Amino acid sequence: GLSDGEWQQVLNVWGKVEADIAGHGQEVLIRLFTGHPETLEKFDKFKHLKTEAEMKASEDLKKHGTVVLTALGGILKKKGHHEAELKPLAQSHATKHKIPIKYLEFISDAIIHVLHSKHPGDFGADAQGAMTKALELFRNDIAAKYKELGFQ
């Protein structure tokens, strides 16, 4: 549940991500993998990445960063009316990829970190608040589909 003003802040912030979707995507995943090494083990196609140099040097990691943020952006543009978009992602990540809701908390915090890192002093207190709310809404609606499936 976000206000109209809050949704406007979220979509304003997203303009930054849209100027460099791959760069933001790559940094969000690198921050996830480096901060939480177990998350890398969920990706059979990125397990071979033994170093952050290998990570930064991976074209396919950049590619998947674009896939992830494009999907998230689509959802954010629905301003909460995202059932059709979110349900299949929830179901894929629980049933096929086996991703605990904890890892979605990790990637949420990682998005906040990357925005401050790439835009220092240009990601204000109101902006962080609005983006956090959106990411919690997203996370919480996925958690609901996880409880439905009894997935832990």
Ligand code: HEM
């Ligand atoms: C902001 C949250 C995220 C979004 C928007 C997102 C989105 C996506 C999309 C669109 C795909 C491809 C289609 C599909 O399989 O459903 C995908 C694949 C996948 N996701 Fe995510 N995802 C998120 C978070 C996570 C996290 C936190 C992990 C792991 C720690 C994860 C692991 C995977 C894996 C293992 C695949 C398959 C990669 C492959 O082999 O091609 N995801 N994701």
